[PDB]
Amino acid sequence: DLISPALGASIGRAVDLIAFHGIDPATGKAASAVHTSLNKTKNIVDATDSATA
């Protein structure tokens, strides 16, 4: 009921993490086997107090 479903989701989070930060889901270190992520885009916007805007 608990262990198997969690372990099953553990990879579903892994792919999502790889495609967003290019990180190893185990350790907060950048991966060497991954070249590009959706974070390394140059079109960034510094968040303010508005959040909505």
Partner: protein, 50 residues
């Protein structure tokens, strides 16, 4: 002098008995449902997740 009303000491009328404010019985009934078990020190295991 004369004959007043203060001599008789007439009894007043009872409006009734009312609470001051509505009763606050708690909120833990809405948040988490009750889990009634038998008498004894209850235990349980939990797993954080992922």
């Amino acid at each position: 002098d004369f004959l007043s009303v203060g001599k008789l000491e007439l009894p007043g009328s009872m409006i009734g008995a009312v609470r001051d404010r509505a009763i606050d019985s708690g909120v833990l009934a809405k948040l988490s449902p009750e889990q009634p078990t038998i008498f004894g020190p209850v235990k349980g295991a939990v797993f954080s997740g992922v």
